[PDB]
């Protein structure tokens, strides 16, 4: 039996123990789960616009207090009067103020220029910080759609434009949507599609830190897997400079003399900070970069203090101690407190006593006391987060910063203990045995005192491997404007010329996985850091040298077209096989599928030249029975590579023998099945090697339809000026002889068989005999457009009869791709060794609908991995949504800090009928609709508003949409439907519909 009462109750014990070991790590991850700070964003006083720019303002001791802003239209004259009690005057003669908060990029988001004018400068600087903190983390900001991601923004209600009661001249419906902190967290979750809790925090000088507390909580509860915490205090008005002066609290110099005897007020500054918070387990499991770790944050109130504004000591001690208790740490653990340091000779005394009580009472080493407001100024709701960026930069650089204007230690504070040393000099603060911890404090004017604990990120990042690879991963970048496209290559060139030695695959991985796909794409496959910074120096000016550039809005899914004959060179795929493992494996698989039916192994054939066969008295790839299997093999291998690099087909087009590849890659037939088909076919297609042959020519279809005769009739329609005719030697030579003198050239391809005619049925006996019923038709994986019927048909229609029928009637390749554009798909990849008929589909798109994008894999005499990298580059630049977690699935690539989006900022500040003549009418209504659009869009420059951009990405929300439809219902005098903005998403579509509604 079971060894009574010794192998069960000991077996039940290990589970009442291990479940307990699992039900306690749940409490410890529900309450003391150390959350990581994934990325940093900051727009701080001075020139600070990025977290790395804040360090050389903080490490070399630069004060950001310069002067009051002049961009904002401030009075600046009634702000200063000798009488200190005059209503309307401010006491501080400066302060650290943002020089870029006045400007914004409206067209970047789904925001109208008028709406962005109505947007609070806080809410317009917060969206950019959100985009930066997402692009800094290697997380595509457009990849977080309908995902749990909380937004926690600390804010200060600030007066902006005219009274809501008085409305405005253009800002009538959007003025609330700016001057409400409500949408100051919802707008960010709306533009980025974040689904997690969009919460705005308002506790004044502690808001952001209080905010991060909430975000921390939302991580330690699991409500949101990710959070974007922080706070902003951007001042569009001098109002509280006038009002803080009435209580006599502003420093006349505007400088936060934290813990100094020369302090004469708490100063003021405007700024903004944002933290990307994720729990450590999720941060490391997902691979998100962990800068530092918020371990424990506490939020408390001052209680019944000496007024609402005066701080409280016991409450501050209580919140600082509660942060340590909730973080599981003690006073000694914190190596460098960075407390509020308001700047006044009243708040600093009280708060230093609280620091000495919570920390200095039991200290082993002198606590390094600092204050970010000394370098920046009191940023209010941006204070509490700004100190967090300080410390995180301190631990990512291993140095404790200075506290400016702190040489004269305050005489009202007892520093005789020595447990607190004010950071007046840069103290080396290196990584060691002790986990490097510290603590940020923020005590708001509302009385809410809050404290967060920041530990250094556990140094487990070390251990990465090193290697080298021949894969030239594309350096892909994208922006919302052409100028931004030229600015995202200049800033990247600046970063790779000022931060040299960063390995190219790391840069490609960070640019590819970490940057959103925006509708102006530049992509190039670099070979060196000198051939890349040269392309980045030509892309900054607009010259497309060694790169691919494309505007590809509303384009996400690609079509795989399969050309037939045309690359008689066939000296390409040797390099691809020799350099690409996938082409060295898929080719082997399809060859070993071809070998049981056609003994020719494509491997000896591969390693050779284009003139190899010519030396053995044989034309370049002319033997049908030997050639058709090799195009099929190279073709299916190229398609397998394209699907292995993340590009999956949407539709499939097979010109002549691309139907076999449609069978194979789309899942309709297996590798063996489709190989068997082309093998058995090649032998019953090489049985007609007499006078037969085709002659591709740009001769017009409506005239060759009269030229049909002498056995030479159309076999394929590859475009408007592209016709493949097939016949015997009756009209063969005379076609060239009688056409070449009239600027029309007959491209007589070196072929010996005719297809898509009445001659294939001469082998109908053998074609139905030497094909067999074994490649049973199966519903595959990709939709396919038949080139025998010219229609989108089932994936299960595919037998020997289908192969006969395809080689029987006209291909109608032009019709197939016209229906392609019609079904919603706009991009096609010419998988082949050389892209014959590349301009044919550009001709198709030129004379019908919109222009199509001709992506090709490789060219004639171009088969190295550099050319395939250029293929991926031109695919991305032309709108193809490449998967960059597959190109960089493994190459020894790691995330690297890169410059964020270059927001093309423009100053947006709010201060307190045609009788059917011709298609000239089409373009006249077009211009009319555009002008009424860029007058309800607040585009003061009516000049242009992108034609390919939707009515939901130019900020055409209700107000804009409704007034637009009313303007059109008056100018054109029509009855546009109520949901017209949804019926016609584009100004192109709207104009076409309106000019089509003439009767």
């Amino acid at each position: 039996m079971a060894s009574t009462d010794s192998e069960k109750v000991a077996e039940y014990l290990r589970r009442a123990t291990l479940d307990l070991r699992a039900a306690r790590q749940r409490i410890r991850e529900l309450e003391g789960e150390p959350v990581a700070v994934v990325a940093m964003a900051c727009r701080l006083p001075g020139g600070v616009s990025t977290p790395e720019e804040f360090w050389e303002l903080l490490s070399e001791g630069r004060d950001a207090v310069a002067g009051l802003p002049t961009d904002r239209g401030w009075d600046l004259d009634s702000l200063f009067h000798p009488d200190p009690t005059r209503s309307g005057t401010a006491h501080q003669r400066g302060g650290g103020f943002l020089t870029e908060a006045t400007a914004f990029d409206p067209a970047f988001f789904g925001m109208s220029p008028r709406e962005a004018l109505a947007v609070d400068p806080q809410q317009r600087l917060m969206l950019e910080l959100s985009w930066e903190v997402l692009e800094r983390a290697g997380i595509p900001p457009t990849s977080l759609q309908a995902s749990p991601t909380g937004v926690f923004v600390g804010l200060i209600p600030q007066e902006y434009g005219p009274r809501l009661a008085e409305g405005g001249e253009g800002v009538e419906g959007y003025l609330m949507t700016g001057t409400t902190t409500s949408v100051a967290s919802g707008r960010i979750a709306y533009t980025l599609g974040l689904e997690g809790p969009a919460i705005s925090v308002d506790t004044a000088c502690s808001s952001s830190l209080v905010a991060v507390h909430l975000a921390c909580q939302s991580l330690r509860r699991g409500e949101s897997s990710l959070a974007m915490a922080g706070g902003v205090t951007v001042m569009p008005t001098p109002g509280m400079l006038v009002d803080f002066s009435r209580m006599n609290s502003l420093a006349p110099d505007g400088r936060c003399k934290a813990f100094s005897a020369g302090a004469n007020g708490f100063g003021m500054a405007e700024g903004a900070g944002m933290l990307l918070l994720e729990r450590l387990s999720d941060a490391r499991r997902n691979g998100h970069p962990v800068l530092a770790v918020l371990r424990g944050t506490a939020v408390n109130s001052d209680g019944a203090s000496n007024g609402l504004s005066a701080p409280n000591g016991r409450a501050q001690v209580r919140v600082i101690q509660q942060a340590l208790a909730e973080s599981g740490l003690g006073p000694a653990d914190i190596d460098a407190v960075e407390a509020h340091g308001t700047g006044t000779r009243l708040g600093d005394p009280i708060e230093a006593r609280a620091l000495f009580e919570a920390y200095g009472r039991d200290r082993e080493q002198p606590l390094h006391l600092g204050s970010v407001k000394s370098n920046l100024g009191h940023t209010q709701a941006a204070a509490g987060v700004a100190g967090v960026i300080k410390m995180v930069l301190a631990m990512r650089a291993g140095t404790l910063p200075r506290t400016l204007h702190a040489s004269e230690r305050s005489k009202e504070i007892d520093w005789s203990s020595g447990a607190i040393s004010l950071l007046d000099e840069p103290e080396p603060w290196p990584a060691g045995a002790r986990p490097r911890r510290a603590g940020v404090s923020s005590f708001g004017i509302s009385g809410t005192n809050a404290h967060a604990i920041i530990e250094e990120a556990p140094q487990v990042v070390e251990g990465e491997r090193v290697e080298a690879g021949d894969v030239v991963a594309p350096w892909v970048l994208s922006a919302s404007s052409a100028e931004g496209l030229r600015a995202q290559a200049a800033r990247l060139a600046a970063h790779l010329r000022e931060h040299p030695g960063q390995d190219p695959r790391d840069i490609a991985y960070s640019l590819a996985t970490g940057r959103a796909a925006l509708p102006h794409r530049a992509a190039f496959a670099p070979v060196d850091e000198s051939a890349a910074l040269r392309v980045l120096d030509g892309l900054a000016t607009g010259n497309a040298d060694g790169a691919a550039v494309g505007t590809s809005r509303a384009q996400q899914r690609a079509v795989f077209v399969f050309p037939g004959q045309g690359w008689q060179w066939a000296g390409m795929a040797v390099d691809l096989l020799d350099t690409s493992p996938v082409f060295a494996a898929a080719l082997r698989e399809c060859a070993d599928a071809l070998e049981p039916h056609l003994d020719f192994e494509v491997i000896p054939f591969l390693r050779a030249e284009a003139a190899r066969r010519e030396q053995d008295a044989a034309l370049s790839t002319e033997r049908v029975d030997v050639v058709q299997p090799v195009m099929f093999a190279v073709m299916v291998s190229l398609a397998s590579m394209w699907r292995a690099h993340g590009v999956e087909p949407a539709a499939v087009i097979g010109h002549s023998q691309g139907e076999i590849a449609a069978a194979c890659v789309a899942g309709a037939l297996s590798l063996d099945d489709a190989a068997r088909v082309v093998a058995l076919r090649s032998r019953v297609i090489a049985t007609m090697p007499g006078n037969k042959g085709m002659a591709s020519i740009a001769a017009p279809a409506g005239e060759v339809r009269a030229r049909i005769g002498d056995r030479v009739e159309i076999a394929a329609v590859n475009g408007p000026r592209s016709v493949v005719v097939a016949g015997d030697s009756d009209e063969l030579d005379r076609l060239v002889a009688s056409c070449t003198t009239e600027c029309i050239r007959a491209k007589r391809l070196a072929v010996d068989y005719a297809s898509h005619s009445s001659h294939v049925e001469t082998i109908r006996d053998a074609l139905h005999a030497e094909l067999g019923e074994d490649f049973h038709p199966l519903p595959g994986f990709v939709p396919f457009f038949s080139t025998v019927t010219g229609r989108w048909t089932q994936p299960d229609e595919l037998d020997a009869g289908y192969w006969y029928r395809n080689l029987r009637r006209t291909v109608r390749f032009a019709d197939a791709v016209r229906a392609l554009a019609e079904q919603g798909y706009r991009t096609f990849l010419e998988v082949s060794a050389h892209p014959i008929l590349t301009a044919a589909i550009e001709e198709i798109g030129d004379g019908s609908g919109a222009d199509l994008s001709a992506i090709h894999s490789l060219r004639r005499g171009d088969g190295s991995l550099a050319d395939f990298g250029e293929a991926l580059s031109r695919a991305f630049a032309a709108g193809v949504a490449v998967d960059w977690e597959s190109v960089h699935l493994g190459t020894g690539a790691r995330r690297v800090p890169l410059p964020t989006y270059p927001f093309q900022r423009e100053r947006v500040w709010l201060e307190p009928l045609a009788s059917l003549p011709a298609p000239e009418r089409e373009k006249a209504l077009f211009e009319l609709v555009r002008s009424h659009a860029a007058a309800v869009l607040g585009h003061a420059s009516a000049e242009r508003v992108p034609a390919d951009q939707a009515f939901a990405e130019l900020g055409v929300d209700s107000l804009s949409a409704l007034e637009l439809r009313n303007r059109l219902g008056a100018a054109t005098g029509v009855r546009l439907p109520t949901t017209t903005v949804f019926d016609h998403p584009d100004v192109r579509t709207l104009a076409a519909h309106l000019t089509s509604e003439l009767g």
Partner: antibody, heavy 118, light 114 residues
């Protein structure tokens, strides 16, 4: 985490030998008692056998039907448990399960479909 | 002898409903320890079984709270406070008094109720 990854499928005829290997990852293998449970098609579980923990003697206990033939062994150094199936009769056509306890079958592993047909 | 057990083999459940599956044992599974020695197990349709409850009432780690166990020495009851698609399958009543364990019993065939 913990996994009880299995292997040992294939083709056997009445009167042959087979091996069922269970690899445990996540905890110490020596103090858990391995068990093999079988899934007859159409019904739930039936327990095949169980070996004691290494320090609990490591003695075995199977069902009377599979006594002896279905040997149960284990090992910590390479951390592997063997069910050697011997003379699989046609009643051994079943899904076998590696259980993580003599009386407390915790993880159940994945499940190997062993077929015994002529 | 052996503690041969019975259960409601064909107990139906419907979404949004609390269900009460039971087991009845011939002998007393309450050991001198004072702890009931019964185990509740769940087999998913075409998947590996899982250990829901041990010692009569307590959870296994990773098993949702929606299962609760109780009962006396002979009668045992598991209530599912809220049934879902993951709470469908076969429920096994396992005695830990005598182990040889020849079979797992008939098992409770749980189905979504219409």
């Amino acid at each position: 985490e913990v996994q009880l990854v299995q292997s040992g499928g294939g083709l056997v005829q009445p009167g042959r030998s087979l091996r069922l290997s269970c690899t445990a990852s996540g905890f110490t293998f020596g103090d858990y008692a391995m068990s093999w449970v079988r899934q007859a098609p159409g019904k739930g579980l039936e327990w095949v056998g169980f070996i004691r923990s290494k320090a609990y003697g490591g003695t075995t206990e199977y069902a009377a039907s599979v006594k002896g033939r279905f040997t149960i062994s284990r090992d910590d150094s390479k951390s592997i448990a063997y069910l050697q199936m011997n003379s699989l009769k046609t009643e051994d056509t079943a899904v076998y399960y590696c259980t993580r306890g003599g009386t407390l079958f915790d993880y159940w592993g994945q499940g190997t479909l062993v077929t015994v047909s002529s | 002898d052996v503690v041969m057990t019975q259960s409601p083999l064909s107990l139906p459940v419907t979404p949004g409903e609390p269900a009460s599956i039971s087991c009845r044992s011939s002998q007393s599974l309450l050991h001198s320890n004072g702890y009931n020695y019964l185990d509740w197990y769940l087999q998913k349709p075409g998947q590996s079984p899982q250990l829901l409850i041990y010692l009569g009432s307590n959870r296994a780690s990773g098993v949702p709270d929606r299962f609760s166990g109780s009962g006396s020495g002979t009668d045992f009851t598991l209530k599912i406070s809220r049934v879902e698609a993951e709470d469908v399958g076969v429920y096994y009543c396992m005695q830990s008094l005598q182990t040889p364990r020849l079979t797992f019993g008939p098992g409770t065939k749980v189905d979504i109720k219409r």
